[PDB]
Design an enzyme around this catalytic site. Structure first.
Site: not given
Ligand SMILES: Nc1ncnc2c1ncn2[C@@H]1O[C@H](COP(=O)(O)OP(=O)(O)OP(=O)(O)O)[C@@H](O)[C@H]1O
Ligand SMILES: Nc1ncnc2c1ncn2[C@@H]1O[C@H](COP(=O)(O)OP(=O)(O)OP(=O)(O)O)[C@@H](O)[C@H]1O
Ligand SMILES: Nc1ncnc2c1ncn2[C@@H]1O[C@H](COP(=O)(O)OP(=O)(O)O)[C@@H](O)[C@H]1O
Ligand SMILES: [Mg+2]
Ligand SMILES: [Mg+2]
Lengths: 464, 47, 505, 240, 49, 120, 49
Positions: A159, A185-186
């Site tokens: 993806k 988001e990490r």
């Protein structure tokens, strides 16, 4: 003029002002921290009017060592974001300061994050058909211009590579630039994404905005608004269509519920903020296309506990047009898009819009694939030899069409060495019309993997 | 030969009961959670 | 008259406050004109306290240690600043108070430098990619989910599975690395225990010194006999000491026993502090709390020394539930999982690691080349093997390839089992997986494969040592080594008999 | 002479695990879950499973072959059971060798907060001074958790999600630690825990398990089958 | 309510008026939010009676 | 009241019909919410048994006066656990019930035989 | 309570007595209603502790 803090309860901060200096809703306040080891500045936003010249606010940064009576000043304006042509060369969070260096400054223009949706009179009355270079998406799940589309999947399903391909394809074909907005988001994933974008030579025309978990929910609820603000700035200033990316919506709803329950309101509807539809509409009403310019958005939503009747997914599904699904069995098959045609659909697929022949071809393909899937049981248990001529020929046509449906992309050259190609819709539909009869059943299996048009594939097959 | 099809169809019909009962259990647990949180909040705020 | 107020405010030998009320582990103090949040207050009887809630005419407080001495009329004294922990390098091989005191019978420890707990995490521009072989000592773990430096991995499991044994074995697996001179292979492991019985702590420590790894480890234990403050504050102390050791460029590894106890203590103190509740009677900020303790770990850049840390949080769940609040939050906040189903441990496999659900985000980036080559993608093989047992449990006639695949799957599953307290080096595991993949053991009876392989490895360790030297010097399997191994296994299997077996080519 | 009820937990520096194979005559306990001397073993189950019969048989079988002193404490139980137990112990000569204390349900919940503490005080006075092996037997522990929940509700404290009083685990840990065998003294503790509606999702049984190492539980389905021991082998486990 | 009023005004004249209510549950949710913000105790499923 | 006036003075047997008694109870809940009384389980009145009991006992056949009644009661959300029919169950002698499934079968007199009960 | 006292009076005299309660949930309901009326704090689904 100056104001004094009264009570401090976690991130919630109460301030008191003189009589003639009461601020208005959604303003900015600046404060300082005296302690040397934790020297810092704090920014606050106005959200309530408790009365008696008392204002309740939410700290934008973690609080520690705050001292009562410290003076506070007022900006006189709402949250300001920088806009200009020098954007999209670096990364920065909602506050606007660049993480790699503080070199970027107030040279650019400044706009308020709060805006209003365009009027009803000047709305576009007719939709447009957005064409891409991938045949599978054009044929099966047509894309609506200016709409919203959802993507489901995980890691190892290709993806991210598809996202990069779409970014570069929209950059090259129709021009314009795309911005990326990561909420919740990490940090390690953000760094890896930055490295990958830098190594792909497409980081030049993309603006990256990140949202860190370590920040209080204010960033987690304002990063999306800031990204939309800058996207609208670009769209209305340059005339180039923009593509907007959102990683998740579930975390945004969680942050909304958090900031709701922190203000001491009343919970309802399975621990949810009572007016969640209001925030959802305010966020989603500024994505529609107008004035001949389009703003397409990509999202990836997460369903909790495999439930579809939950109020948050129900509200999210109210503003959706197309859905895409990815699996691993299709990956085990060994095709590039790795999408199941049976589990995805589009809301614009009508015989009177996309042509009757397109609908007929789509129905034939779906029927063939469904029959193949149904007969997989008999294939596994007894094989194709027992199957009659019709069953074996339809199975061969189905497997050949499945092999053909894969198309070579462009960045796949990073492991194969062959750039992809774009095909017009007419050629693809005529090729599927001729393949409906299954005249190429005599072709070897390897020759069915697409690289581009049909003449080159025929030449390669004759060259085998 | 006639015996085999009975078991095949039995499996085919057995799948849907699993599906439906799982759906019903999900709805029941969601309802109990929402009602308990509603009642505890209602007890809390009134005092 | 405003000048009077200004002068009175600006007027302000030691500042003294007054307690007004107390009860149930908290107290209320007033009279302090200017204090900073999370001040370490001092009480006359010697007990300590912290400031959490501030009011226009009151200051909330939480008493950490002894509580019965608190009464109305006592005088508090503002002291120092935000509380800090004295960190150093003498902490190895000892058990300390989460406040930083030597509860163990050993004498007082030294002090090197004080570090405040509340500090900013490293930014995004100070991190690199992850590529390093952290071993685990368990075949299935690194065979399915590789582990690398700077990567956070979660272990969630049901009741009575054996997570503690796995953690202890991983901790003690680094004896050979410690024996090496340079500190590149040296890792300083630390352990954090929250809300565990003292006898269990003693038994675990005894297992540690029986293994012989007492030199390079320390324990931060907060038994249930303590108050809520220690349970709430121990993980921060552990993180502080770990990050301090990391900052000098030394590799360290942090392990958390549990997080549910910390969440319970936080909920208790929040509700006792009269704060608005939410879903499941949980405070709003609890999620953020976790983000402040688990996001510290990250791989460093070479410009700052290239330090590294790795964390292994442990989560327990009841009645095999995954959709609960805290498990969902922690799963969403981290990457990589290791499910421990009780059914698999109930019979058969002792490690009892689930296969169809386990996944690792980093994957091949943390895999050594040799065993990555030897892996041969047995994940899909085991998946189809399970899908085929689900069909052919009662089968008498099958396809020849199907029968062969079923037999290979059964042999590999019976091989994957491994007992406890048995760490293994990389070379023997690589040899074992090469034996399993090639099918050389297909003729070995299924009831006695494990023990059989045992003798071979012992014999492999006895009459030959060049293969281990090669695999340790090049980290790669050569053709001549493979041929020699094939000859050795053939000659060994030629003269083996467990129960009415047969030697076949 | 009189001693204060409240005390202080023993030092961690004097803790050592105890390992020993103590054997009874019953097959299920001998094979499935062997007991350990100096440790904790607890019983579990819902209403009317027959655990009282089990504890009575256990005490009858063990007290005869024992030279130490035993103390029995009943936090909550019907008067008939206590009177019958007293009569049965009077029927034998072992009654002189033991000590008894209990409290009934009709009393207000305040009296149900200190009976366990009094029993622990007597046990520690015997153990620390006499230096002899002692037996501490507890009928139940759910009742005082209930009474604490109600007294906290009356105190005006905000309840938790399930309705239990906050900081219940703190009280759990404070109570459980008092039973501990040091390097020189050994004490055995027997207890049975009632679960509400036989639901194991309740946090109270889950948090009371954490203080246990060797456990035996009971089920209602096997009782309905016809078996009287009604011990489930799949879920029961030990640590030795 | 405004739609009902404008319908009734022509009802007085005695003619035929058709009325459409494409959405009802949204109005219920709006009233629920208004009531909860007015601190009134919610009823079943957070909906006042 | 008017029915009782007909029963007492005239000395005549009286037929009585009432419809949808449940709404009555509902009304009370609403006004309770406005009075400020503490809410009860599932947001009902703090007291509901006494009013139902006094309304039910007001209908009573004397030796010289026979009165026959028949009340239709509603059930909310197709759930039988709610207190509204639960309390009414205790004031009844002859009861018949309806179901959605039996109506969906096709027969219009959708009366459950397994659930209906009587005391005569 | 009245029934119990009436029984206890003959109980102390040495006469055997039998007691039957028609229902018990009604008493709990009445007590709950009284407690809720008297502004006492509620409990688990609105029952006093
Ligand atoms: N490989 C193994 N083979 C056989 N038995 C094992 C193995 N690993 C662990 N066990 C046994 O399983 C149990 C594990 O106990 P342990 O204390 O580690 O449990 P846990 O699941 O981590 O939970 P908790 O912390 O609540 O005790 C012990 O009885 C141990 O002997
Ligand atoms: N071995 C046995 N043979 C026959 N009956 C037995 C046996 N063991 C137990 N019972 C029966 O079980 C019951 C014993 O009740 P007991 O007091 O032991 O139960 P409990 O599980 O402690 O429950 P509770 O606390 O609810 O009273 C009696 O009815 C007794 O006849
Ligand atoms: N169609 C494909 N053919 C070959 N390799 C693929 C294909 N799709 C994905 N991959 C591989 O899978 C890996 C994971 O890709 P992706 O799923 O985009 O990232 P992530 O796993 O982080 O979500 C990539 O390194 C890519 O090489
Ligand atoms: Mg364990
Ligand atoms: Mg019993």
């Amino acid at each position: 003029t100056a104001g004094r803090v009264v009570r401090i309860t976690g991130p919630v901060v109460d301030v008191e002002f003189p009589r003639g200096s009461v601020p208005e809703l959604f303003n900015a306040l600046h404060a300082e921290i005296t302690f040397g080891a934790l020297a810092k500045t704090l920014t606050l936003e106005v959200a309530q009017h408790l009365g008696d010249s008392l204002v309740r606010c939410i700290s934008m940064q973690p609080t520690d060592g705050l001292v009562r009576g410290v003076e506070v000043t007022d900006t006189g304006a709402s949250i300001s974001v920088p806009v200009g042509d020098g954007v999209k060369g670096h990364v920065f969070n909602a506050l606007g300061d660049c993480l790699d260096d503080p070199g970027y400054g107030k040279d650019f223009e400044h706009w308020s994050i709060h805006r209003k949706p365009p009027a009803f009179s000047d709305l576009e009355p007719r939709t447009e058909m957005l064409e891409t270079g991938l045949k599978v998406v054009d044929l099966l799940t047509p894309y609506v211009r200016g709409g919203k589309i959802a993507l489901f999947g995980g890691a190892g399903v290709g993806k991210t590579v598809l996202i990069q391909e779409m970014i570069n394809r929209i950059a090259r074909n129709f021009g314009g630039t795309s911005v990326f907005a990561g909420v919740g988001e990490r940090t390690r994933e953000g760094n890896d994404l930055w490295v990958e974008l830098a190594d792909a030579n497409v980081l030049k025309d993309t603006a990256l905005v990140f949202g860190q978990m370590d920040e209080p929910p204010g960033t987690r609820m304002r990063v999306a608004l800031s990204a939309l603000t800058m996207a609208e700035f670009f769209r209305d200033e340059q005339g180039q269509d923009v593509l907007l990316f959102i990683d998740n919506i579930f975390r945004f709803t969680q942050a909304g519920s958090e900031v709701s329950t922190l203000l001491g309101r009343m919970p309802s509807a399975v621990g949810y903020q009572p007016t969640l539809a209001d925030e959802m509409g305010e966020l989603q009403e500024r994505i529609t296309s107008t004035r001949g310019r389009s703003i397409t958005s990509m999202q990836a939503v997460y369903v909790p506990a495999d439930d579809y009747t939950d109020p948050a997914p129900a509200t999210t599904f109210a503003h959706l047009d197309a859905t895409t699904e990815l699996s691993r069995a299709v990956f085990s098959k060994g095709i590039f898009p790795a999408v199941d045609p049976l589990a995805s659909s589009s809301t614009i697929l009508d015989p009177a819009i996309v042509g009757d022949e397109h609908y007929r071809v789509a129905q034939e393909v779906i029927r063939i694939l469904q029959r193949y899937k149904d007969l997989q049981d008999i294939i596994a248990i007894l094989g194709i030899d027992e199957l009659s001529e019709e069953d074996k020929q339809l199975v061969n046509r189905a497997r050949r069409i499945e092999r053909f449906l894969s198309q070579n992309m462009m960045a796949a050259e990073q492991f194969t060495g062959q750039p992809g190609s774009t095909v017009p819709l007419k050629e693809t539909i005529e090729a599927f019309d001729k393949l409906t009869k299954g005249e190429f059943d005599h072709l070897p299996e390897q020759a069915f993997f697409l690289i581009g048009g049909l003449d080159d594939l025929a030449k390669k097959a004759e060259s085998l | 030969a006639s015996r085999r099809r009975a078991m095949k169809s039995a499996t085919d019909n057995a799948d849907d009961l699993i599906k439906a009962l799982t759906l019903a259990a999900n709805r029941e647990r969601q309802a109990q959670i929402t009602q308990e949180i509603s009642e505890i909040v209602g007890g809390a705020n009134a005092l | 008259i405003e000048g009077a107020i200004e002068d009175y405010v600006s007027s302000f030998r030691e500042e003294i406050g007054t307690v007004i009320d107390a009860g149930d582990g908290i107290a209320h103090v007033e009279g302090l004109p200017s204090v900073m949040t999370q001040e370490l207050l001092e009480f006359p009887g010697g007990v300590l306290g912290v400031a959490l809630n501030l009011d226009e005419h009151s200051v909330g407080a939480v008493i950490l240690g002894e509580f019965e001495k608190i009464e109305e009329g006592q005088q508090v004294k503002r002291t120092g600043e935000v509380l800090s922990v004295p960190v150093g390098d003498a902490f190895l091989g000892r058990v300390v108070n989460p406040l930083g005191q030597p509860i163990d019978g050993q004498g007082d420890i030294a002090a090197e430098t004080r570090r405040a707990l509340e500090l900013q995490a490293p930014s995004v521009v100070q991190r690199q990619s992850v590529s390093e072989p952290l071993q685990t000592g368990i075949k299935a773990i690194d065979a399915m989910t590789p582990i690398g430096r700077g990567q956070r991995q979660l272990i969630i499991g049901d009741r009575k599975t054996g997570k503690t044994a796995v953690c202890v074995d991983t901790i003690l697996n680094q004896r050979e690395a410690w024996l090496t001179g340079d500190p590149k292979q040296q890792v300083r492991c630390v352990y954090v225990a929250i809300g565990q019985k003292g006898t269990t702590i003693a038994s675990v420590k005894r297992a540690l010194e029986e293994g012989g790894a007492m030199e390079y480890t320390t324990i931060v234990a907060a038994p249930a006999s303590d108050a809520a403050g220690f349970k709430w504050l121990a993980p921060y102390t552990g993180s502080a000491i770990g990050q301090h050791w990391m900052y000098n460029g030394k590799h360290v590894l942090i392990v958390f026993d549990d997080l549910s106890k910390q969440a319970d203590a936080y909920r208790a103190i929040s509700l006792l502090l009269r704060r608005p509740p939410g879903r499941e009677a949980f405070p709003g900020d609890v999620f953020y709390l976790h983000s402040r303790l688990l996001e510290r770990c990250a791989k460093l850049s070479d410009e700052l020394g290239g330090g590294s840390m790795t964390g292994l949080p442990i989560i327990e769940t009841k009645a095999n539930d995954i959709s609960a609040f805290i498990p969902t939050n922690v799963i969403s906040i981290t990457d990589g999982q290791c499910f421990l189903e009780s059914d698999l441990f109930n019979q058969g496999v002792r490690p009892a690691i689930n296969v169809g659900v386990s996944v690792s985000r980093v994957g091949g980036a943390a895999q050594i080349k040799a065993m990555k080559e030897v892996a041969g993608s047995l994940r899909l093989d085991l998946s189809q093997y399970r899908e085929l047992e689900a069909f052919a449990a009662f089968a008498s006639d099958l396809d020849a390839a199907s029968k062969a695949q079923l037999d290979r799957g059964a042999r590999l599953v019976e091989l994957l089992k491994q007992p406890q307290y048995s760490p293994l080096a990389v070379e023997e595991q690589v040899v074992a997986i090469f034996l399993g993949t090639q099918g050389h053991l297909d003729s070995v009876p299924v009831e006695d494969v494990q023990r059989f392989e045992s003798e071979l490895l012992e014999h492999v360790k006895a009459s030959h040592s060049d293969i281990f030297d090669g695999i340790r010097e090049t980290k790669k399997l050569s053709e001549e080594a493979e041929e020699k191994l094939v000859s050795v296994i053939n000659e060994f299997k030629k003269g083996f008999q467990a129960s009415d077996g047969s030697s076949v080519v």
